[PDB]
Symmetry: C3
Subunit: 89 residues, 3 copies
Amino acid sequence: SSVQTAATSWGTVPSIRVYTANNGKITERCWDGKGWYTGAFNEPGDNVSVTSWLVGSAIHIRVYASTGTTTTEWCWDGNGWTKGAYTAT
Amino acid sequence: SVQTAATSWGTVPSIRVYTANNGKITERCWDGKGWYTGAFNEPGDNVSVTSWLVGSAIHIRVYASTGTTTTEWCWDGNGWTKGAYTATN
Amino acid sequence: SVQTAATSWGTVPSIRVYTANNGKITERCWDGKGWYTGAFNEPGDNVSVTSWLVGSAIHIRVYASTGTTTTEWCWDGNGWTKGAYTATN
Ligand SMILES: CC(=O)N[C@@H]1[C@@H](O[C@@H]2O[C@@H](C)[C@@H](O)[C@@H](O)[C@@H]2O)[C@H](O[C@@H]2O[C@H](CO)[C@H](O)[C@H](O)[C@H]2O)[C@@H](CO)O[C@H]1O
Ligand SMILES: CC(=O)N[C@@H]1[C@@H](O[C@@H]2O[C@@H](C)[C@@H](O)[C@@H](O)[C@@H]2O)[C@H](O[C@@H]2O[C@H](CO)[C@H](O)[C@H](O)[C@H]2O)[C@@H](CO)O[C@H]1O
Ligand SMILES: CC(=O)N[C@@H]1[C@@H](O[C@@H]2O[C@@H](C)[C@@H](O)[C@@H](O)[C@@H]2O)[C@H](O[C@@H]2O[C@H](CO)[C@H](O)[C@H](O)[C@H]2O)[C@@H](CO)O[C@H]1O
């Protein structure tokens, strides 16, 4: 059937991030006020969810990428995507 | 199964729930005083949503997908309009 | 694959991740000091979530769908309870 998307935004410009899971891969499209562009996030998954929060001016994003029963947390804390501590336990 | 996406704002709060059911996305709304059916009505098998305030004014972006094609819908205070979002997918 | 939904609040932050797996939705929680399994447990194939603060108190709404039926679940400080949400008129 269809791709599966997740979205988050912040500020008043705004900034938007849209994550799309498509045939086992998640990609990211980004808006920061002046056109859509392809983001750095490129990781495996059939399903995606996202949440974000600001600490002052700094955006923090958590992307939950799932393949089968395995969910991997990916963390943006200003400069790159790092693996988070999340487990299903 | 049907598929949903939710957003909220303020502290009343206002809530918007989007449901993709048999190729149509509809919108249910809470503004503190009962659920009602909102103005949003667009095609899609999958839905995500994000929203942000600019002062007291809400801005909403809904991402509606069918197959690998995603269409953005914009609320900026005066009806739903098609957004600039693209994704090759 | 499993289907997830995430929400977060504050600046620590607190995070809740809902996972629909084999018809059941369960919850994992972060409050700054390790992931733990939350109280939430309801039926669903698909899940979305939103949350808002009233003072320091978190309010969470989880939209759980199976077939054509979506149920709203509410956290308001006193345990999970069924919400008034209905999908259609
Ligand atoms: C790998 C690890 O465990 N990192 C810790 C940070 O935890 C990450 O972020 C939190 C919110 C959850 O998503 C975790 O599952 C995830 O691993 C943790 O908290 C965060 O540190 C970030 C810098 O790494 C950043 O400062 C962020 O503001 C903060 O929320 C920190 C502090 O407890 O410890 C890391 O080890
Ligand atoms: C039935 C209808 O169309 N009512 C209008 C309100 O529209 C609803 O809410 C908006 C945000 C969309 O989700 C619509 O599709 C939905 O029908 C509309 O919205 C108001 O937004 C305020 C904040 O900017 C505030 O949260 C308020 O609770 C909400 O009602 C208003 C104002 O644009 O017009 C009504 O006609
Ligand atoms: C408001 C708050 O954060 N409450 C935490 C307890 O509940 C968790 O968080 C809330 C918002 C919901 O997401 C719940 O589903 C989630 O479990 C949390 O867990 C509760 O503690 C109880 C006794 O201390 C009891 O063990 C219960 O089973 C457990 O669900 C506790 C962690 O101990 O922190 C609260 O802050």
